């Protein structure tokens, strides 16, 4: 199938530059245009520019032409976008998206996005704490979880039992604490079974932090 896989999230210092990648698979790379689209808080979706991988021809949105440099490498089926003179306003999710074939002037397949955070703060991995099920109320439904505290930048991912437990799972959106670090909880309502084991799998890609936490009664 058609797939566009993007590089991981990063915090970058103001004034620096970042090169984000988009690896394409499942089709002839030179036959489709690759677009770069920004999604910044309060700005909606904005088209930055596109490249024709066959000829390496770009077209930029005039708004982003000074900021972004788009390239493609045919030998590795990878498109790139380099952002220059990074400022706070560049903090956003960046997507790559393929333009369909002639007659389909639309972005038919999209990458998963790359969260670029512009800050002087250093990357910090989370501390993971258990949210143990209360020894009380055993109508059948109980709750348990994991507290994923003091990490930077976003995002963090949480799975339960290596992706086997999905029903009743609520991973809350992160809250930016006054300290400048994020925190969130991931919870699960269970029918007061424990007997079953519960393990939250925390992955913070910016710090390469991976934690498996056992939540026991």
């Amino acid at each position: 199938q058609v797939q566009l896989v993007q590089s991981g999230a990063e915090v970058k210092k103001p004034g620096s530059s970042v090169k984000v990648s988009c690896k394409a698979s499942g089709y002839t790379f030179s036959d489709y245009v690759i677009n770069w689209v920004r999604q910044a808080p309060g700005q909606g979706l904005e088209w930055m520019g596109e490249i024709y991988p066959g000829s390496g021809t770009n077209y930029y949105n005039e708004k982003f032409k000074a900021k972004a440099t788009i390239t493609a490498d045919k030998s590795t089926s990878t498109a790139y976008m380099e952002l220059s003179s990074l400022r706070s306003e560049d903090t956003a999710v960046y997507y790559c998206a393929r333009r369909g074939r002639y007659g389909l002037y639309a972005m038919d397949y999209w990458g998963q996005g790359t969260t670029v955070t512009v800050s002087s703060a250093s990357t910090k991995g989370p501390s993971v704490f258990p949210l143990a099920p209360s020894s009380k109320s055993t109508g059948g439904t109980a709750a348990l979880g994991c507290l994923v505290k003091d990490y930077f930048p976003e995002p963090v991912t949480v799975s339960w039992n290596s992706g086997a437990l999905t029903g009743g799972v609520h991973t809350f959106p992160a809250v930016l604490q006054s300290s400048g670090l994020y925190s969130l909880s991931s919870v699960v309502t269970v029918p007061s079974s424990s007997t079953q084991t519960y393990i939250c799998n925390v992955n913070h890609k910016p710090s390469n932090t991976k934690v498996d936490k056992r939540v026991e009664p």
């Binding site: 909606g44 949105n61 708004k63 389909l104 639309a106 972005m107 209360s134 507290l147 909880s185």
Partner: protein
């Protein structure tokens, strides 16, 4: 540039109701108009292209119409999995431009939250901090009041809330309220309680523990 204006910016409808979203281009774009669906934290997905053509994997409850500057996107019968922000986009003239998006929400019956309280872990306490967590599970509507009580005394400024996106299956919300205290302040008191006030509750619900 071609400005794309979407209407409304947000809407609420019940499961099975017809939903209509419009998009106006600042210039004639013929029929080079696409619609995308974006669920939170996920990439936009192409639903409709060239005004009315359905993309692969898209049910026919979604449709598009229009010509020139004015376009309409319709969901014939709103389903729980349709909770998302929808965007129009013109592919007529560069720079390609998007509408501001329309957030689609579901109206449903009132559902009471199930409330749970979590003491800080021993691991966290050994670090010099204590987080107390109150969970409000699967409720409707979004509006909920969480009050923290430390030894039967109201707390303020030391708590933060987070609300999930409306559930893709039952259209309810879940909320977490986190009370942050220093280990010293936490070790000073015994009773920790979260009092929940919600439409679905007959009376405020209190969940507590003794440190």
């Amino acid at each position: 540039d071609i400005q794309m204006t979407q209407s409304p910016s947000s809407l609420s409808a019940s499961v099975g109701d017809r939903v209509t979203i419009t998009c106006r281009a600042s210039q004639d774009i013929s029929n080079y108009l696409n619609w995308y669906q974006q669920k939170p934290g996920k990439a936009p997905k192409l639903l409709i292209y060239y005004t009315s053509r359905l993309h692969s994997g898209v049910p026919s409850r979604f449709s598009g119409s229009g010509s020139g500057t004015d376009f309409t996107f319709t969901i014939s019968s709103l389903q729980p999995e349709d909770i998302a922000t929808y965007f129009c986009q013109q592919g007529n003239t560069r720079p390609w431009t998007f509408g501001g998006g329309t957030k689609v929400e579901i109206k449903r019956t009132v559902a009471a939250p199930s409330v749970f309280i979590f003491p800080p872990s021993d691991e966290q306490l050994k670090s010099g901090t204590a987080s107390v967590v109150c969970l409000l599970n699967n409720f409707y509507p979004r509006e909920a009041k969480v009050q923290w009580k430390v030894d039967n005394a109201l707390q303020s400024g030391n708590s933060q809330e987070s609300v999930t996106e409306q559930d893709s299956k039952d259209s309810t919300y879940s909320l977490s309220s986190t009370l942050t205290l220093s280990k010293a302040d936490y070790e000073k008191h015994k009773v920790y309680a979260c009092e929940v006030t919600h439409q679905g509750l007959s009376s405020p619900v209190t969940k507590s523990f003794n440190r």
